[model samples]
Target: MSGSGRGRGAIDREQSAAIREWARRNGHNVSTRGRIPADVIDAYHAAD
Candidate 1:
């Protein structure tokens, strides 16, 4: 089966929780479900 609908081009489910938590802890508000901003993901990727 295809991936569950988080949104178009959304992050992987396995990683979603970690990313969401990371964003929240880092002062970035983001949804746990649905489309995530590209810049958000980029920031998450670039974080230390």
Candidate 2:
């Protein structure tokens, strides 16, 4: 994911959920799977 940009990505809530689901289905650790906050670093973390 791009580190810095003008603003948040163009994706919507549905896209976010889909991505999260995909990650889980692929056996990925979706511990910190969330939309990049308003202004922050680190694209992901361990959710659970």
Candidate 3:
């Protein structure tokens, strides 16, 4: 058996919004797990 099958533990609807939709349009790769906003800084730099 697996451990800790989380449906919704210690989080609310706000947690669902971490994925920046603009990043999709910006043509950058972002991981669904805790994409640090600073990642955008590097992504923007790397793209240029």
Candidate 4:
């Protein structure tokens, strides 16, 4: 196997809400369960 789903990437669950509001404003998506996926993170930094 090349990867495990349980692994953590660049995101932290702590910022979920923060990302949610920002994401919505920037035309991004939030998982609602955690901070952000690569999709939203891209917009997060790219937009900001």
Candidate 5:
């Protein structure tokens, strides 16, 4: 369940939002879902 599906920086906002919303409705946590790399998570926080 790697984030190979996330694509590059140009993520599909509409599709991503829909998918995440569905996952949330079905009780999926971000920690167990997105499968994002530690580096990606770190970078995300660092951008702030």
Candidate 6:
């Protein structure tokens, strides 16, 4: 999507699943099909 515009970053299918799963398990409303909030990604990475 934005990979070719605005210099946006992307995550692979695996990462999408990982992030979705992480959010689901921790009760955060997120989706793998659209733009994920930066705070969600930050929190996901911040987790051990």
Error of 5 at 48 (Å): 37
User: What number of clashing residue pairs does each candidate have, in the order they appear?
Assistant: 0, 5, 0, 0, 0, 0
Candidate with more favorable, higher lDDT: 2 or 3: 2
Instruction: Write down the lDDT of every candidate, Cα atoms only.
Output: 0.60, 0.45, 0.42, 0.54, 0.45, 0.63
Q: After superposition, how far is residue 40 of candidate 4 from its true place, in Å?
A: 0.7
Tell me the alpha-carbon RMSD of every candidate.
8.6, 7.7, 12.2, 6.9, 10.0, 6.9
Model 3 earns a TM-score of 0.29
lDDT (10s digit) by residue, model 5, range 1-48 = 234444344344544454445445545565475564443433343333
Q: Write the per-residue lDDT of candidate 3 for residues 1-48, one digit (tens) a residue.
A: 022233222234553233355465564565554653554533433343
Work out the TM-score per prediction.
Answer: 0.54, 0.37, 0.29, 0.38, 0.34, 0.56
Q: Which of the predicted structures, 4 or 5, would earn the higher lDDT when compared with the native?
A: 4
Query: What are the runs in model 6 whose C-alpha is more than 4 Å off?
Result: 1-13, 32-34
lDDT of 2: 0.45
> Which residue pairs come into collision in candidate 2?
31-46, 31-47, 32-45, 32-46, 32-47
lDDT of each residue in 1-48, candidate 1, tens digit only: 133243233445576667677878876757754665556666666566
Minimal lDDT window, size 10, model 1:
1-10
* Regions more than 4 Å wrong, model 1: 1-13, 32-34
Off-target runs (Cα >4 Å) in candidate 3 are 1-19, 31-34, 41-48
> Following a full C-alpha superposition, what root-mean-square deviation does model 3 have from the true structure?
12.2
Residue-wise C-alpha lDDT for candidate 6, range 2-39, written one tens digit per residue: 22223332555457668678888987877644677656
